[PDB]
Amino acid sequence: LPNLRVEKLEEGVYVHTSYEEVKGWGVVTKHGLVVLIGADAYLIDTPFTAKDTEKLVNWFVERGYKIKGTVSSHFHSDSTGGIEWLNSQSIPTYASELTNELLKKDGKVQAKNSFDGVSYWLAKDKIEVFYPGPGHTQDNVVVWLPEKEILFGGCFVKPHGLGNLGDANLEAWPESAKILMEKYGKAKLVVSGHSETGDATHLKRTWEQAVKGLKESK
Ligand SMILES: [Zn+2]
Ligand SMILES: [Zn+2]
């Protein structure tokens, strides 16, 4: 497998890409962000592993950044795998109350800090965690960077197909996607967990895929 990749998207915003061999299934490629605000770095999703979470943290700590906080966009291991390691390093971890409940139900380590607001703001006015409603999972949130007009759609944004529906809410996905398109249609870039970054048409495409997926299910 490829090693952890970190690439600059633009000033202050990096995409981290990690790779997992899923036994009996195939290989999963997962994108998240590192967001720099002054001398602080925020991880938007952890890699699958403690190993890769540490490599990612060390890359930014060696450039002088504090890892100020991490946000997990949903309970799946491709957003949360590194939480236990981060908690051991006293790096504040955040996830919604629902995400923490789903982690606990699967016997996984919880984020230290939780929230249930529909919007939760980090770095005062620079990092918005938003819940559009169920889709890919019950608990999926997106992360908006208003100063860059970049949306981290995570694993909710699926412009080319819905992927694994095991934990999905197909009935809710269309409305959640319509809510997301209506609020973040001004987006310059939409970063997805499993596909290449796109423009704001990734939101409409996800809505189309969710509508199509629901209808095929019926
Ligand atoms: Zn997922
Ligand atoms: Zn994912």
XYZ file of C-alpha atoms and ligand atoms in Angstrom:
220
model
C 0.000 0.000 0.000
C 1.072 3.642 -0.404
C 2.300 5.417 2.756
C 0.356 8.285 4.340
C 0.343 11.258 1.933
C 0.122 14.949 2.998
C -0.371 17.527 0.187
C -1.032 21.285 0.282
C -4.486 22.210 -1.154
C -3.822 25.946 -0.588
C -2.321 28.221 2.075
C -3.293 26.814 5.513
C -5.156 23.723 4.194
C -3.613 20.252 3.638
C -5.250 16.990 2.515
C -4.031 13.837 4.274
C -4.645 10.573 2.474
C -4.348 7.190 4.260
C -4.806 3.662 2.891
C -6.294 0.565 4.565
C -6.397 -3.075 3.328
C -9.879 -4.302 4.459
C -9.622 -8.132 4.627
C -12.222 -9.867 2.423
C -13.257 -6.487 0.781
C -10.411 -4.496 -0.866
C -8.392 -1.286 -0.253
C -9.951 1.994 1.022
C -8.339 5.369 0.332
C -9.413 8.086 2.819
C -8.970 11.891 2.628
C -9.036 14.258 5.576
C -7.685 17.763 6.266
C -5.126 19.601 8.356
C -6.208 23.234 8.883
C -3.648 25.794 10.077
C -4.900 28.816 12.069
C -1.912 30.900 13.251
C 0.414 28.543 15.181
C -2.398 25.969 15.699
C -3.135 22.929 13.508
C -6.552 21.118 13.511
C -6.916 17.544 12.171
C -10.181 17.043 10.313
C -10.563 13.265 10.620
C -7.820 10.907 11.781
C -6.218 8.262 9.596
C -7.321 4.633 10.180
C -4.328 3.881 12.486
C -2.497 5.275 15.493
C 0.657 4.735 13.332
C -0.546 7.159 10.615
C -2.147 9.592 13.145
C 1.293 9.882 14.847
C 3.122 10.401 11.452
C 0.592 13.116 10.544
C 0.880 14.833 13.971
C 4.718 14.653 13.844
C 4.777 16.244 10.311
C 3.048 19.396 11.676
C 4.656 19.416 15.162
C 8.096 19.425 13.408
C 6.948 22.655 11.584
C 6.221 24.198 15.054
C 2.422 23.750 15.148
C 0.444 22.742 18.222
C -2.177 20.102 17.381
C -4.901 22.285 18.935
C -7.745 19.843 18.275
C -9.089 17.032 16.118
C -12.630 16.547 14.788
C -14.057 13.160 13.650
C -16.748 13.557 10.933
C -18.370 10.152 11.766
C -17.880 6.987 13.819
C -16.198 4.822 11.065
C -12.521 3.955 11.720
C -11.383 6.071 8.685
C -12.394 9.195 10.764
C -11.731 7.931 14.356
C -8.942 5.274 14.349
C -6.398 7.708 15.845
C -8.556 9.061 18.752
C -7.096 6.685 21.428
C -3.519 7.648 20.474
C -4.385 11.401 20.406
C -6.057 11.165 23.871
C -2.804 9.481 25.206
C -0.812 12.520 23.818
C -3.253 15.018 25.480
C -4.330 16.348 22.050
C -8.026 17.399 22.448
C -10.305 15.101 20.371
C -13.865 16.158 19.377
C -16.837 14.284 17.993
C -20.608 14.724 18.256
C -22.500 13.018 21.096
C -24.103 10.680 18.482
C -20.684 9.823 17.017
C -19.378 9.065 20.562
C -22.496 6.898 21.264
C -21.858 4.876 18.024
C -18.132 4.520 18.934
C -19.107 3.277 22.407
C -21.684 0.823 20.947
C -18.824 -0.723 18.846
C -16.472 -0.785 21.910
C -14.205 1.895 20.337
C -12.500 4.763 22.169
C -14.571 7.992 22.395
C -13.486 11.567 21.645
C -12.759 13.403 24.891
C -14.917 16.445 23.929
C -18.440 16.102 22.543
C -21.199 18.439 21.326
C -24.771 18.119 20.054
C -25.278 21.580 18.436
C -26.361 21.488 14.768
C -23.333 23.786 14.186
C -20.268 23.578 16.445
C -17.578 26.254 15.917
C -13.837 25.698 16.465
C -11.180 28.430 16.277
C -13.972 30.957 17.132
C -15.223 31.621 13.541
C -12.937 29.577 11.246
C -14.053 25.897 11.552
C -17.753 24.980 11.447
C -18.830 21.415 12.204
C -22.355 21.031 10.706
C -24.895 18.217 10.871
C -26.997 18.075 7.628
C -28.890 14.980 8.817
C -28.391 11.257 8.217
C -26.875 9.881 5.013
C -23.755 7.707 4.736
C -24.231 7.219 8.532
C -26.728 8.464 11.160
C -24.085 10.792 12.690
C -22.179 12.164 9.614
C -21.055 15.830 9.946
C -19.259 18.125 7.484
C -16.624 20.730 8.262
C -16.816 24.204 6.666
C -13.920 26.651 6.415
C -15.678 29.992 5.751
C -12.412 31.979 5.169
C -11.400 29.558 2.335
C -14.915 28.547 1.145
C -13.714 24.909 1.451
C -16.168 22.214 2.613
C -14.860 18.908 4.033
C -17.840 16.743 3.052
C -16.238 13.599 4.479
C -17.982 10.341 3.693
C -21.410 12.027 3.241
C -20.249 13.521 -0.059
C -20.449 10.740 -2.695
C -20.660 12.305 -6.136
C -19.974 9.079 -8.104
C -21.974 6.538 -6.103
C -23.074 5.910 -2.483
C -20.607 3.105 -1.644
C -21.213 0.799 1.368
C -24.851 1.262 2.605
C -24.482 -0.926 5.745
C -24.767 2.011 8.169
C -26.589 4.362 5.749
C -29.968 6.057 6.067
C -31.172 5.896 2.421
C -34.565 7.448 3.270
C -32.935 10.492 4.894
C -29.963 10.964 2.548
C -31.747 13.003 -0.142
C -33.169 15.614 2.267
C -29.811 15.825 4.138
C -28.050 16.336 0.775
C -30.580 19.019 -0.253
C -29.921 20.817 3.068
C -26.168 20.616 2.402
C -26.468 21.900 -1.207
C -28.631 24.824 -0.095
C -26.282 25.923 2.680
C -22.896 25.395 1.014
C -23.636 26.108 -2.672
C -21.130 29.040 -2.463
C -18.292 26.475 -1.818
C -15.166 26.891 -3.986
C -13.968 23.341 -3.180
C -15.610 20.232 -1.722
C -13.240 17.622 -0.282
C -14.770 14.133 -0.157
C -13.588 11.200 1.974
C -13.241 8.735 -0.910
C -13.088 10.674 -4.175
C -11.112 13.481 -5.765
C -11.815 17.050 -4.610
C -14.398 18.878 -6.695
C -16.230 22.178 -6.902
C -19.723 22.886 -5.431
C -21.313 20.442 -7.997
C -20.189 17.563 -5.680
C -23.159 18.573 -3.414
C -25.743 18.374 -6.240
C -24.113 15.132 -7.477
C -24.401 13.604 -3.955
C -28.127 14.665 -3.870
C -28.642 12.974 -7.342
C -26.832 9.802 -6.160
C -28.871 9.725 -2.911
C -32.184 10.177 -4.863
C -31.113 7.450 -7.367
C -29.965 5.068 -4.565
C -33.247 5.443 -2.624
C -35.354 4.735 -5.786
C -33.299 1.566 -6.727
C -33.833 0.378 -3.069
C -37.673 0.611 -3.665
Zn -17.849 5.949 6.626
Zn -15.124 6.943 4.750
